[PDB]
Structure 1
């Protein structure tokens, strides 16, 4: 078998870790491999393997996100834990355990727990406060499934999770079979400002869904990156609302979530999500990056919440990348890029179980159910788009294509790969620490 390396352990609270790295980093340069003839770090005259190994050649930093259980992995933690407790499982797959779902930030706990009671007992709920933490909570084992958009499907794909079911959007009499191509990312501006143009974006306020998402961050800033040629985007735009980014940035201080919840990537902010990016577009922004279906879902009294009750379709028009205007009604001839639909991810061992339980659990609570108030409708929600995308129709089956490489397609994997040196998400760094 293969095992992870030996490590220098230290405390979790007092540390101090920067003096260990500061010490050893100046140690392996001067003393590593015949770098000094007088003293050897990795050899000794009166013994072998003292304080270090004699096979070691260098020291790199353990990233700060990675704790103990993510260092050892999940297969090795499970093997050592079963070897201590002494279980030796037989495991024929006849009945499956209840799936521990994961949900974030106390609205998804409400809808999740109501779904936990309206089921037989087959879906449970475990919380989180960011999506980046709930992915780690899947990797440990304290949760099983999640519904993620494709940017976080790339991150959880790097970390070792697999997609199982993929959300559809097109209504059909057979949508469990049909593989949809995806949905189009657009940017939405108003009739009040006609001077705006994709070629003219210097010093303008830009609303975003959240950091790491497809249509809000990866697709537009991956296209803006090849023009502006440098990684910092807080200096290109004047202001803008993007949650989840660093608290220092202007991108943090345009948003509204008060107090201390500013730039917190969850439903604590009003501006989080597609519709909240539309809120900062209507209130204080110049351009927002959303899906193409955002303006029809918030146009014309579809939202009873009053700011979207008063609004209209025709004033808001989306902009192409060459510099022209094309209407929101005609989204196909003007789009930033085609991003894939969202997907449900889980570990590789509970793939068959989450497949089976969500397929059966879908037909009871899907889009066939009318009279949602006074019953349960799993796919509808209170316009905040929580636990599931609100305009889902059915959870599509993934056959022959269950891998982030195969599911996400080549253009999107390249399109994220052109932005991978600019990424600042710590969990992606900790997951890509594994690779030699």
Structure 2
């Protein structure tokens, strides 16, 4: 198992040694080895890793995109973090800086004057021009002349002053050095500060590095993509694109990746790495930023479920793709393109296909294996929208998606204008099972719907993480049933469902789901973490099955957070936390269109207003609850609660988090690497 690198310049070929010089420290047998391979250009390196005579090259974002492209599909594995560990500058932010109250938004850039860091640069050129590519005046080739005739005078340093005069109108000559007053990050910002231009395309950090005062920077704002402004200290919520600085990238599926990290991490250690002597990995004796960027402070492993496009981001990928493929609609009608819905199964895909047909094209369809695969498809743009439960709204939100519409179940004249609050997650016990409270819950046998689910796991274990700081809930309760847990765990010691279905998150497991969790309570366990409708749902005869036929709801009470108990109908003063109804989520650039079309769809094929026997009905399914819940009355618009934090509620947010960072979801892990 040998790990071959690759170096472009002949200078870093010597920097790549050791090799076996100042790196021959604690070598086992066949493991932590580092070789050197020489190639001409950066392309030749990725083309080499495409074969096998090379394994690891560190690349800038532009080349990370190039390396991802066919035929040589390369995946990012390791990143150079900068600054602190609590504040790692793994990514920077492309940003549009403007003077306060200057009177224009992102979609009003035409005819304004621009300040760039330099032609071809990432934050100062590629990203903003890429994002603007379609709005540019045809012909969009050559690009410089197009940008020049989109703005009313610009300072684009390192560009040709003769062929493209307007691109040097704010800085005659386009100096490619410090000699030009308007060069680089600080230079472009000066072009704004002086009033030469109306907008400067720079890095988020730039204004904080040229304006030490709060009151000075208070005279500036940022343009957000949603056509609003925000103060310069809110770049994380108001940027053109997020971009990875320096990323090392392996050959995807078919090439050592875990060995590369085992190397680079061990290479940190022995500051033979670079914060002791020999040799400081980051700095070079003959050059600057030779093998790695000199600004580096070490390396971090890129999470497993992270592919290139998810790593570079929707905004960046969009911008660069525009810049290369140059494909834009020659008829920019500025109306809504079809909404691509994401289906989680064959039955969902069948219904979606029927919907697509009846919707005369306004809905299209894409499938995926899992919920998280769909969310990722919405993130990268392969899909547009899907309906999600509160739990999956939290993760989708941490991934940059927003909720557009909430599913409503209340019969009311103003249903589509008034989003419902949702339900309550509660803890149910028997009244006979004295003495049970929320305090002395330790050592009792628990009943959960399934591990990872909202009410059955995340919320209750979330409130319990603030008691015992460890993800060993196995050793908190005596035993119980939490479908999906390890087979050798104590949370399977009283499940049912014979075979290998025992402790499996599916109906074959008799204690899976709300119903099963409550059945667990009445038969084996002594406390169920379930929904506030669950107990009435399965008592009185509503559940005709034998185990639940004679059950009475008034035989059960609820555990309150203050250590007391109340009956099942008093959930409003005796719950763990409030959870929201399902919501449709989408990308931010699709919010308006998804909002428009889905509301149109429910007036065409909504609950009533059509004969569900003769035609298509959006809220009816061949089996159960496909795409939307079957008892959906309508889709309601979201005003205040248009963000994941506001849609979920402070109770839900405070409850998890903790249990987060301790979670298993690989999508959450990946999006947490980017924010933060």
TM-score (norm 2): 0.57
Deviation at 1:145, TM superposition (A): 1.3
Distance 1:363 1:253 in 2: 50
CA gap of 1:317–1:156, structure 2 versus 1, over 3 A, is same
Q: Report if aligned partners of 2:244, 2:312 keep a CA contact under 8 Å in 1.
A: yes
SS at match of 2:562: coil
Deviation at 1:12, TM superposition (A): 2.9
Deviation at 1:398, TM superposition (A): 0.7
CA gap of 1:252–1:158, structure 2 versus 1, over 3 A, is farther
Q: Report if aligned partners of 2:532, 2:571 keep a CA contact under 8 Å in 1.
A: yes
CA gap of 1:38–1:182, structure 2 versus 1, over 3 A, is closer
CA gap of 1:336–1:21, structure 2 versus 1, over 3 A, is same
Q: Report if aligned partners of 1:33, 1:57 keep a CA contact under 8 Å in 2.
A: no
CA gap of 1:356–1:274, structure 2 versus 1, over 3 A, is farther
CA gap of 1:356–1:19, structure 2 versus 1, over 3 A, is same
Deviation at 1:147, TM superposition (A): 1.7
Deviation at 1:160, TM superposition (A): 0.7
Deviation at 1:433, TM superposition (A): 0.8
CA gap of 1:39–1:427, structure 2 versus 1, over 3 A, is same
Report the more deviating stretch, 325-334 or 274-283. 274-283
SS at match of 1:306: coil
Q: Report if aligned partners of 2:443, 2:478 keep a CA contact under 8 Å in 1.
A: yes
CA gap of 1:255–1:81, structure 2 versus 1, over 3 A, is farther
Deviation at 1:157, TM superposition (A): 0.7
Distance 2:399 2:650 in 1: 19
Q: Report if aligned partners of 1:243, 1:263 keep a CA contact under 8 Å in 2.
A: yes
Distance 2:624 2:480 in 1: 21
CA gap of 1:201–1:322, structure 2 versus 1, over 3 A, is same
- Higher RCO (C-alpha under 8 Å, 6+ residues apart): 1
Report the more deviating stretch, 163-172 or 344-353. 163-172
What does residue 150 of structure 2 align with?
Answer: none
Deviation at 1:382, TM superposition (A): 7.6
Q: How does 1:67-106 map to 2 (within 5 A)?
A: 67-89=307-329, 92=332, 95-106=335-346
Report the more deviating stretch, 426-435 or 124-133. 124-133
Which structure 1 segments of 5+ residues have no match? none
Which protein shows a greater Rg? 2
SS at match of 1:54: coil
Distance 1:240 1:89 in 2: 58
Q: Is 1:244 aligned with 2:448? A: no
Deviation at 1:2, TM superposition (A): 5.6
1:18-64 per-residue CA deviation (whole Å, 9 max, x = no partner) reads 32222211223434786344434223334443332333331111111
SS at match of 2:265: helix
Q: Report if aligned partners of 1:209, 1:242 keep a CA contact under 8 Å in 2.
A: yes
Q: Report if aligned partners of 1:150, 1:213 keep a CA contact under 8 Å in 2.
A: no
CA gap of 1:312–1:152, structure 2 versus 1, over 3 A, is same
Q: Report if aligned partners of 1:107, 1:267 keep a CA contact under 8 Å in 2.
A: no
Deviation at 1:428, TM superposition (A): 1.4
1:292-336 per-residue CA deviation (whole Å, 9 max, x = no partner) reads 122333444545666656654344443334455433234333222
CA gap of 1:140–1:123, structure 2 versus 1, over 3 A, is same
Q: Report if aligned partners of 1:101, 1:143 keep a CA contact under 8 Å in 2.
A: yes
TM-score (norm 1): 0.84
CA gap of 1:195–1:410, structure 2 versus 1, over 3 A, is closer
Which structure 2 segments of 5+ residues have no match? 1-240
Deviation at 1:394, TM superposition (A): 2.2
Deviation at 1:156, TM superposition (A): 1.0
Q: Report if aligned partners of 2:408, 2:636 keep a CA contact under 8 Å in 1.
A: yes
CA gap of 1:60–1:363, structure 2 versus 1, over 3 A, is same
Deviation at 1:161, TM superposition (A): 0.5
Q: Is 1:58 aligned with 2:304? A: no
Distance 1:79 1:221 in 2: 42
Report the more deviating stretch, 317-326 or 175-184. 317-326
Deviation at 1:423, TM superposition (A): 2.8
Deviation at 1:111, TM superposition (A): 4.4
Deviation at 1:83, TM superposition (A): 3.1
Q: Report if aligned partners of 1:275, 1:384 keep a CA contact under 8 Å in 2.
A: no
Distance 1:207 1:383 in 2: 27
1:81-120 per-residue CA deviation (whole Å, 9 max, x = no partner) reads 3333221346746543332222324443454445445544
